[PDB]
Amino acid sequence: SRYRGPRFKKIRRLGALPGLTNKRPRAGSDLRNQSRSGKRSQYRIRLEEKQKLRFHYGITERQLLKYVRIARKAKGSTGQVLLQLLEMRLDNILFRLGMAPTIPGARQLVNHRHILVNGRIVDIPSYRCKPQDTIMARDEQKSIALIQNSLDLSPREELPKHLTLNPFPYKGLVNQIIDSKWVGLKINELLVVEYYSRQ
Amino acid sequence: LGNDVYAMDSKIKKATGFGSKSKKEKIRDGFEENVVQVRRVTKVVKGGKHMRFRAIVVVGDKKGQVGVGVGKAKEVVSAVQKAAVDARRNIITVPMTKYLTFPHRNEADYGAARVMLRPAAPGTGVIAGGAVRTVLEMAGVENALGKQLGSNNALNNARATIVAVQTMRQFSDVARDRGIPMEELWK
Amino acid sequence: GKDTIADIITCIRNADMNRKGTVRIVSTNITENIVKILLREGFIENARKHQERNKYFLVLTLRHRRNKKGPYLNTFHLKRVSRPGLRIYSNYQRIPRILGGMGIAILSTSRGIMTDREARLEGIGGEILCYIW
Amino acid sequence: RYWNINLEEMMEAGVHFGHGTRKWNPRMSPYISAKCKGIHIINLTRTARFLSEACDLVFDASSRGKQFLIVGTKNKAADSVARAAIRARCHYVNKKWLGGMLTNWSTTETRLHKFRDLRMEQTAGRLARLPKRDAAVVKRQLSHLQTYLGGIKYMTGLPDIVIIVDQQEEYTALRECITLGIPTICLIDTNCNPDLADISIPANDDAIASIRLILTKLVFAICEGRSSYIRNP
RNA sequence: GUUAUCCGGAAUGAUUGGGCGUAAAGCGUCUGUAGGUGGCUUUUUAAGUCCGCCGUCAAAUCCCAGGGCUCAACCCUGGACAG
Ligand SMILES: [Mg+2]
Ligand SMILES: [Mg+2]
Ligand SMILES: [Mg+2]
Ligand SMILES: [Mg+2]
Ligand SMILES: [Mg+2]
Ligand SMILES: [Mg+2]
Ligand SMILES: [Mg+2]
Ligand SMILES: [Mg+2]
Ligand SMILES: [Mg+2]
Ligand SMILES: [Mg+2]
Ligand SMILES: [Mg+2]
Ligand SMILES: [Mg+2]
Ligand SMILES: [Mg+2]
Ligand SMILES: [Mg+2]
Ligand SMILES: [Mg+2]
Ligand SMILES: [Mg+2]
Ligand SMILES: [Mg+2]
Ligand SMILES: [Mg+2]
Ligand SMILES: [Mg+2]
Ligand SMILES: [Mg+2]
Ligand SMILES: [Mg+2]
Ligand SMILES: [Mg+2]
Ligand SMILES: [Mg+2]
Structure with missing residues (x-):
């Protein structure tokens, strides 16, 4: 139920995908055969957008679909609510807090019971995080070592204003609900919403 | 009076030859053309089948300005181009709301093409079929419901869409027509 | 003349589409009230009454041509709703509103004729005579 | 700014009459006036307001520096047109259009x-x-x-004001200006529809005299507007 | 994935939402019974119609707001538009 396949590859075809890979793609070397499909059918544009989303967060389709139903339900602007929902996933928050290298990494971190949300172990990636929530490492040697090395050796200080990080114990804190401008990717949710008119 | 030869050679040098001056200026007009349909229509002659290409193309800025045009030639390329040029001289403006959608619900009729547009909440995107959707999208309408009832001809549906969004009245104007303040009609 | 209301409406629609400012209609409590209302909404220039051989005629002046007769962006639409065949009524929470409120809906209610606006203020439903664009 | 018109001179030149009552367009019934001996008589109080607004827009247009065409292809109006254009220093069409x-x-x-x-x-x-x-x-x-x-041979570029005689025969002039976004200031007799022209002046068809009167008032406006554009640029 | 079943798309049985000169479609033409609809003005009544209040339309389900199984599915509490 997880994408274990070649990553660079999906990246060449989709675009830039942070939650997947930090290695910038090869020059692309397709300039020999110069093979194109011509251009893309409007359908293919829509499809590639959705795929962008899906692989950035490591979600399965059947899951994405149910997020979208939750989205159409919710009273509000649909694409926005969707992006909220996807961006509140525990593993993704674990990632954007620099507590992980990438999303498969963060996911693994959560799975192996190395993380705590308000003094309780949550081992499932898709646990939805709500405002005022404590993201901690379990107090064991291993957990702490992991989080420390992956947090410190990665310099990025981009923290998106709803996310606090605190230094020695390493208490991360979820402050509030995401803003559409603070979202974790370049995507027109409009296209995805459109793709999903038929479900 | 200056001499006839140098002034007529001035209007001759200012109207430039079409055999010494190549053509690409079009991205300077701030537009984008979208080929909706390419078909091979045929005239028939004693020799045989004489093949032409019809192009149905719509132009917009994606900023609230759109038009349709149709063209015919031997090669895809030239048809496409004439289509562009024709649309550019047929063009109109679509009334928009602060959220990028339609003022109101509207139908439209052209030939056997009937068209129904109604405004949508922001965040629903543009959901429609081929002609209607490319025209809408190229106008820059962000959120709209549309369905074409009646026929399916790509072309008549394009025209129809245009007649729809042409007859769209914006509130300031109905307030100007009726002679009544805005806040009164809002209620 | 099976329906009188529909007929007034029609005389307008027709005289309108033919670019005439002046219409003769036959008066009635209903007719008169509807036209009054049409004036206070502002869809029509001016009304007046005439009498001959015990017949009453409301002549209606109509909004002038739109910056010529050939180039008209706007027409003035009318549509019958409750008609002798099927009478349509609505409670307070189904009261129609036309093109987000740009147009108007005429209602006959217990308090007399009005628009949908009035019906919402006073909290009343009733029989829906017609719509106007 | 004022122009030269009075009920007496319009009476003199014979503008007020137009074609037989079997020939008429009822489209013009809104501003016609009376009908006599099977010959129509057209409103001159409308004619003067239209002729004034015509000369005024002609004045503003000349003064800003815009270019003028005139058209009529009849036999007599053709002789009056070469002289109208020369006196106003404008472009003309008299011969076959x-x-x-x-x-x-x-x-x-x-x-x-x-x-x-x-x-x-x-x-x-x-x-x-x-x-x-x-x-x-x-x-x-x-x-x-x-x-x-002959009459256009000076003009380079697209003409943005076009003046016309008797829109009945001149269908294509009207069509082409309708299409290209050009104003038409035109002479209407009882037979022609007031669709095709931007400013349409109730006028006479058959009379060389009416043509002379209205065209001379118009060319006088073009000429004073010509002094004002010789001044402003 | 394939097959079966049902609704959709189908405005293709159409109240919302189609048609009948030539495309499927106006009885060969009238007279007329039931039936449907029917001009204007005042009054009455209040059957429709409208507004308020009450009773009920079991619980579960669907919808909204919280809570519990680490999450979700699922369970539990409270409440309500329709009609
Ligand atoms: Mg599964
Ligand atoms: Mg494979
Ligand atoms: Mg477990
Ligand atoms: Mg569907
Ligand atoms: Mg039709
Ligand atoms: Mg369809
Ligand atoms: Mg009811
Ligand atoms: Mg159906
Ligand atoms: Mg029907
Ligand atoms: Mg049919
Ligand atoms: Mg047959
Ligand atoms: Mg038949
Ligand atoms: Mg028959
Ligand atoms: Mg028989
Ligand atoms: Mg009978
Ligand atoms: Mg009977
Ligand atoms: Mg009865
Ligand atoms: Mg009655
Ligand atoms: Mg129940
Ligand atoms: Mg809930
Ligand atoms: Mg819970
Ligand atoms: Mg319950
Ligand atoms: Mg009830």
């Missing part, structure tokens, strides 16, 4: 290019060095090109 003069500009203007070469040829006297067939041929080209290009 060619479909496409306005709308199809590109080809029209190439036809102007070759007309200019013909005009240099003729005055150079290099038409004396030819066979007789060549000279009579070059002279066909000349005869035509004079009929068609």
